[model samples]
Target: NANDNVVIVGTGLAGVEVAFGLRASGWEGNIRLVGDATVIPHHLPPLSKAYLAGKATAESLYLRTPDAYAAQNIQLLGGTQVTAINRDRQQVILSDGRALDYDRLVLATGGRPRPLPVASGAVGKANNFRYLRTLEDAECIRRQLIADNRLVVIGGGYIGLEVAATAIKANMHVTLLDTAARVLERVTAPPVSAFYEHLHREAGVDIRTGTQVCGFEMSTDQQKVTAVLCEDGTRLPADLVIAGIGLIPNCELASAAGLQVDNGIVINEHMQTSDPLIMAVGDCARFHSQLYDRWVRIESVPNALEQARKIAAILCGKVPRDEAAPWFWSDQYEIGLKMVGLSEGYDRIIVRGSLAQPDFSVFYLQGDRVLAVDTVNRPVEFNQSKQIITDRLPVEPNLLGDESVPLKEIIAAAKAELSSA
Candidate 1:
């Protein structure tokens, strides 16, 4: 194989899969994955849920260990922050002033947790903060929980809900504050969001909906944050404040160096950036999803892996994996939520099992055809729902609504129909 250099940035799920996928797709060229994290590339989703929650450890998070990395001859440059992409010169400038010459430069810079303009920023506090995207963040929050105090979470999203559950187990009072009426307001319908809000509330979490934080109050003498002052003159007691508003793609470098950016770096179907030799993946790349026919940016493991593998196929000259329905998962309070496909505004929602109970699947349908699924503790359906989505199978609302009917069987029949045509 012709020798070529490929540099991938950000050693999260996106980076690990890029190297592996490139090799698997027959890329024998020098494979080097670069990033700013020192630890070996690890599964990040478990960082908050299992790793810090005590089910797993740092050793267990490895998607690649040192031995495994060496065996593959894959140079994983952890703790390497890429400073610039000199597209005209065809090179990458690293934090340490080393220049990497690349035949292809993949930018998977990922994202950073969105900051709150009010709370800590208003108090003129320059330090004392935590966001759960990194292993360090998770550990810090876990330690704070053990120290015993109130947790003021400033969002009702999945991250906020997850941290609340973990903190509660550590005997900390968790209060989830958000302007939305309920938790996961964007992902779930009002009914579903309401249900989860009640669940967290019943489990001793102070769920604050439709609330706004005015600013922060500090201890008179020490000047440490004392509480999050609300717009209505209520003070939320806090030993720590975790903001889970969302994330913005790491695009500062791209902007400085002059690159096409639309919410994130704009890339094509093959994950190629504005410059053909340069590419991007994960939460940082903004591309029009063919499945939805709309521009969307996804912040999840699946999105990262999918983009990585696609780029690998192009490099290897092998057929690329068919783009399937994008999927994502979250764990909170012993419940696993697996959702697939984009249901911007589905008209119909079919429940396969009792919503009152823990195990169920909600099929979101548009114009009486199944469009997406949100499964709770039902992996069998989630696994099959993706195929149904990729195949674009149009199922009758009544048939899919029936719990006795199987999705796999429906998928099989769909393939047969396409074959006949």
Candidate 2:
């Protein structure tokens, strides 16, 4: 085990966690964490929130100090890219002309921000366009978020909404454009989308729903963007434009190596790729979710941490426990949104509180089985729902809507009823 080597690519949350988990699980092998970023791997959640708002520093974002890695005997190779995977030779070819022989290779090669194709035409020519995937990208946007700056944010996903909130607080002239009929159309129910739309509108964001950004009007010198051209002939003037459309999983390395690639690098429940020698995890890997009974690729820190731990346990010759129901959260303005389980295919939804009051929990169910729960400013509900979903608890919809009945009691009652049956 001491002579064995584990090469983990992409030093993001998953990669870093896997390295730490391996050491904790008693793997005495030589561990190497590699990444293309020159900086040490850092926490990403803050990049879109406090970091962008200038409330947090770059140093605070680092996951661990260089001393920590050294102490753990984990070798970190920053600013290095794995060019190719030589399966036959059991070696990975690095861009720096170095080859690494590995007993096991873990790909935590997270995703990159999906670019706006139309805006690509203005790439090197325009300097006003931006993305928020990395610390560097957030720093670039932070410098341009001065008061009165026209900031047009494309896409209404978590990044876009969070940036809009931060920019608005900074007194920037913000315009958010989403092609869908409502913001957050892909993730939330219409009511939740309406709630956020109202919140952003109230916070002084010129949110244009069903608005498609087709092109960019560049300055005569082609140095900066003058305006953002929409599909309906509406040109929104902007000093800076941020595209938060989505993420493209970094699967080129995996695909080029002849590994099975579907929407993402396909992995089984054990997080092992088609090739037993290689495993994939986090945002770049899709695995069959036992809870949802479907394959899913979750782009959240929790998902990454969970998969990383599982991989470590497996490598250490330990049986990995069952995974919990996936949960995620987002913060915008004063609203703290938390959701557990996948709400897709839910036949009915029960609202536990008033959306008008703006503090409520939405319970999604297929018949009596609780599929998911979306809580706004209700942490208790969010915490309880995780267990409820994981246990596959059947809830009484009417009783769930009643605030008088405590969630704990509901969970207990559900368990009792299920056991009796």
Candidate whose lDDT is highest: 2
Q: Candidates' TM-scores?
A: 0.92, 0.98
**lDDT (Cα, 0-100) at 56 in candidate 1:** 79
Top TM-score prediction, candidate number: 2
The ten-residue window of minimal lDDT in model 2 covers 119-128
Q: Mark the regions of model 1 whose C-alpha exceeds 4 Å error after superposition.
A: 120-128, 220-223, 404-421
- Cα RMSD of all models vs. native, in order, equals 2.3, 1.2
Give a tens-digit lDDT track for model 2, residues 175-284. 99999999978767888788888888999999999999888878877578889999999999999998899999999888999999988999987788888889999999
lDDT of 1 at 414: 69
Give me the displacement of residue 291 in model 1, in angstroms: 1.3
Clashing pairs in model 1?
Answer: none
